[PDB]
């Protein structure tokens, strides 16, 4: 399905959840201003998914060494470059 | 227990982990530039702690509706304002 809405500095990030914005060259913003646009995805009737590698439980590698699901992120070696 | 080092915009955040910086009016920065300063804590001989309310597994409320441990953060109603 489509990648979720872009977000963050220079739009270089992508939403991984309502309040989670991440990018390989940015790290992850959780609940910060950078992730506010990510709540808008809730209004879009089509499914979206960001990232490429599955990790944790229902999560995906969102940034260097970081795994995120729609409600949280945690450091994960499997997600390291 | 001393509070961990300050970090983030206007120094309004506090470190919850080597690469996690959170603040009540900021949200949480996970692996972003804002959290680089938090690596210094690793070399301070005294233990530190941020937040006042325990949550999830070994985490503490770091921001409105967010629970963080030194390894990550997740949405948690128990942390709502
Ligand atoms: N567009 C939303 C809602 C939706 C979910 C499933 C099917 C159709 C619509 C969406 O895709 N939400 C994601 C989760 C998510 C991801 C990013 C974000 O900024 C907010 C939520 C999903 O459930 O797959
Ligand atoms: N000061 C560090 C290391 C230390 C731990 C225990 C006793 C003495 C020193 C520290 O307190 N680390 C925290 C975790 C942490 C928090 C913020 C941060 O920027 C980096 C690490 C701990 O282990 O409690």
UniProtKB/Swiss-Prot annotation, chains A, B:
Top-level taxonomy: Eukaryota, Metazoa, Chordata, Craniata, Vertebrata
Coiled-coil annotated spans: none
Residue pairs linked by disulfide bridges in the UniProt entry: 4-48, 7-21, 15-38, 22-28, 55-67, 61-79, 68-73
Organism: Bos taurus
Protein name as it appears in the record: Neurophysin 1
């Amino acid at each position: 399905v489509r990648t979720c809405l872009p977000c963050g500095p220079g739009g270089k990030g992508r939403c991984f959840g309502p309040s989670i914005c991440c990018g390989d060259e940015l790290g992850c913003f959780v609940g910060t201003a950078e992730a506010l646009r990510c709540q808008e995805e809730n209004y879009l009737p089509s499914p979206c998914q960001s990232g490429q590698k599955p990790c944790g439980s229902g999560g995906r590698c969102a940034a260097a060494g970081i795994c995120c699901s729609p409600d949280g992120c945690h450091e994960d070696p499997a997600c390291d470059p």
